[PDB]
Amino acid sequence: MVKLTAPKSNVVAYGNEFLKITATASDSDGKISRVDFLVDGEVIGSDREAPYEYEWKAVEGNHEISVIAYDDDDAASTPDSVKIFVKQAR
């Protein structure tokens, strides 16, 4: 399983500034190999070690941020996601 811990849906963010995405992940059968971080369904990057975190260069407008945990068989969890709105670059 995976849980998105940040950001919240009301996060204040601006274009071209970095937004931190954070997630927990765990698995009672075997081991989490990585957590992928997604924006609008596109993988922006991965983290292989807890605490799982990524920074995204924010782009203005509506976006959905998600996380997917992958096990040792490289099998995917159901995603956790949040919808945000990124303001125009200052």
User: In this structure, what CATH number is given to the domain that contains residue 35?
Assistant: 2.60.40.10
Resolution in units of Å: 1.7
Give CA–CA dist 78/3, Å, rounded: 10
Joined tokens for residue 82 = 């949040």
Is 55 annotated to bind ligand?
no
Sheet of strand 13-14: strand arrangement: 13-14, 80-87, 61-71, 32-39, 42-47
Task: Check whether 7 is labelled as a binding-site residue.
Answer: no
Place of tokens 């976006």: 63
47 labelled as ligand-binding?
Answer: yes
The domain containing residue 18 runs over which residues?
A: 1-90
Please report, as a single letter, which amino acid is at residue 37.
Answer: F
Q: Is 27 marked as binding a ligand?
A: yes
Neighbours of 74 (CB within 10 A): 8
| Cα separation, 90 vs 33, whole angstroms | 38
Overall number of domains in the chain: 1
Q: How many CB atoms lie within 10 A of CB 75?
A: 10
Which one-letter DSSP state was computed for residue 50?
S
CA distances to 20, 29, 38, 87 from 35, rounded to whole Å, are 14, 17, 10, 27
Count of CA atoms in the C-beta half-sphere (13 A) of 17: 10
Answer yes or no: is 51 a known binding residue. Answer: yes
